[PDB]
Design a protein around this ligand. Sequence first.
Ligand SMILES: Cc1cc2nc3c(=O)[nH]c(=O)nc-3n(C[C@H](O)[C@H](O)[C@H](O)COP(=O)(O)O)c2cc1C
Ligand SMILES: Cc1cc2nc3c(=O)[nH]c(=O)nc-3n(C[C@H](O)[C@H](O)[C@H](O)COP(=O)(O)O)c2cc1C
Lengths: 138, 123
Amino acid sequence: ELIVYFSTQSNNTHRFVQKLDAESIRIPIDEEERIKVDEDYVLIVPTYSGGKVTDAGQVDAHGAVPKQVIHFLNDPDNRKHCLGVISSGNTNFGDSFAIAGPVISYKLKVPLLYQFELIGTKEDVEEVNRIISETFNA
Amino acid sequence: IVYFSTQSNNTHRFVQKLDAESIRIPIDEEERIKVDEDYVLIVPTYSGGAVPKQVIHFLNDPDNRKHCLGVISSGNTNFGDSFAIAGPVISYKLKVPLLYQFELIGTKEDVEEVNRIISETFN
Ligand SMILES: Cc1cc2nc3c(=O)[nH]c(=O)nc-3n(C[C@H](O)[C@H](O)[C@H](O)COP(=O)(O)O)c2cc1C
Ligand SMILES: Cc1cc2nc3c(=O)[nH]c(=O)nc-3n(C[C@H](O)[C@H](O)[C@H](O)COP(=O)(O)O)c2cc1C
């Protein structure tokens, strides 16, 4: 069991991932630093599009996936090991809530396993532990 | 499979190409159904509220909601970043995985991929 995650200096996603059972590897905040992951992982990432909309009024997802995660997933050696994605955010962004997940899910053709807010609740920790376990069992 | 499809019938035609057995949610909003076996939900996305009213009525019943193993959603990629957004909404509300997303009537790849995914889920 292995998690790859991203978290800005606000550390919300870090504090959620710290509570989970599985081992975790952090994608660096420093944009110039890169990592290489050798084993299969579930990806956990926050959303950063700012709840933008288009002139028509539909969701604008530009910047949903943090740039550091885009660089990470651009490497096919990293990308191939992704078993699924979990995304986070804040429901105050409405239809842009947690949209980094569906964006990544559709591009990689991997399931969007879960979505949560901020540092997560006790129930999120319980569900994600189970979900990650089941994914690695399968 | 449990699915919804309007008069345009795109989601219906995709589901008939799949190997698994399927049950249809009715188009008439007053008509409602009940399901007691585990199912993967497959629904299109309709904005002016991503989820069709008929699916909202279906999922509002606690007896239907408990049997969902996961959701697959569809739409049209020309809707930009509102593409297929019924799935994520349902996924988050039910706490079930969003397994796949596809366009319209689906491609050869979608048929094979959703066949594979549904088999892995039923375990
Ligand atoms: C500039 C900015 C833009 C954001 N945009 C979104 C968004 O589009 N959708 C969303 O659900 N959450 C959004 N959020 C909320 C964050 O994703 C959320 O606070 C998350 O917990 C931050 O994770 P981190 O502290 O690990 O970086 C945004 C936050 C900031 C600061
Ligand atoms: C009024 C209307 C609104 C729609 N809104 C969306 C949307 O917000 N996002 C999307 O991805 N597709 C949207 N679509 C495309 C449909 O979801 C797509 O054609 C789907 O295949 C319809 O399935 P059905 O023929 O089974 O009803 C819309 C279509 C119509 C007619």
